[PDB]
Amino acid sequence: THLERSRHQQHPFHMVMPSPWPIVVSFALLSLALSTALTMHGYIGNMNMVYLALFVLLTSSILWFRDIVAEATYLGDHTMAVRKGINLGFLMFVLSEVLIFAGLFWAYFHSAMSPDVTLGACWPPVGIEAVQPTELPLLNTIILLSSGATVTYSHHALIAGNRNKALSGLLITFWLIVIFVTCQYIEYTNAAFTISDGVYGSVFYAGTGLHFLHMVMLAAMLGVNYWRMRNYHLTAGHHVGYETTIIYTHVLDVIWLFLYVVFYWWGV
């Protein structure tokens, strides 16, 4: 027939209504960047406008995300190509966020590959004492190798159809990551060298610093992957809000292993 075909869309790609959260996030990125440069130089007195700028930005993301899940499970222009659009739009995105590490790995090969004169002739220098890889940093590698063996233990389990392994298998992975925040909170509270400890104090809390600033959003990504799977939002044949979480962690084994070999093993 053709009368219903003249009442529907004829191309698989999605058409979105005009949303105003585009200019809401833009106004937050102004009041983030403008206000974080004022309190460094006065003019306000208190450091809470940046705390305001981290609040209006992040609630603007979930209101952006509330309209997206209204399109994901409640309006649904997600065809095969549009499913391949985001799944390649995010797989090509993490090529950018793995290259920003090469903007921080290459500083570590700038102060240790050729020895400098302001420091000692050894890396790490005198006065600065590093943690051996046969200590609590080795717990940080095995707890992700166990994370890399439970994110795929629950990847196929959601497609498998049973909810005893699909629901409970993501709560044990979520608390495996909040416990990873606290063991990278030990070296932020018990290690000798600080952020202002010269060039070894600079890049060590940058290469491992940005690896800590991604778990705050990864655990926040599990914070909706358990809420949606309990509120029956995600499905077992079409899951984008669950697939972007696995590739957020399956590449994380590769970058942390490259982070562990030069910061700790080659870094002593």
């Binding site: 809401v24 106004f27 206000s35 306000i44 209006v56 209101l63 409640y74």
Partner: protein
């Protein structure tokens, strides 16, 4: 559980999609209160930041 229930409400709603949640009336007027202040007070201190008057 509410996925078919909300699908009756979201589809054929004749509303803006950011007003199409049933739990969305309280989500906006406090949000428009923190939006009406965070875009003027970083900018109202700019004539205070031109004369050297800092804090």
């Amino acid at each position: 559980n509410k996925v078919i229930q909300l699908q009756k409400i979201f589809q054929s709603s004749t509303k803006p999609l950011w007003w199409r949640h049933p739990r969305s009336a309280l989500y906006l007027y406090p949000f428009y209160a923190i939006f009406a202040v965070a875009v003027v007070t970083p900018l109202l201190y700019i004539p205070n930041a031109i004369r050297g008057i800092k804090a």
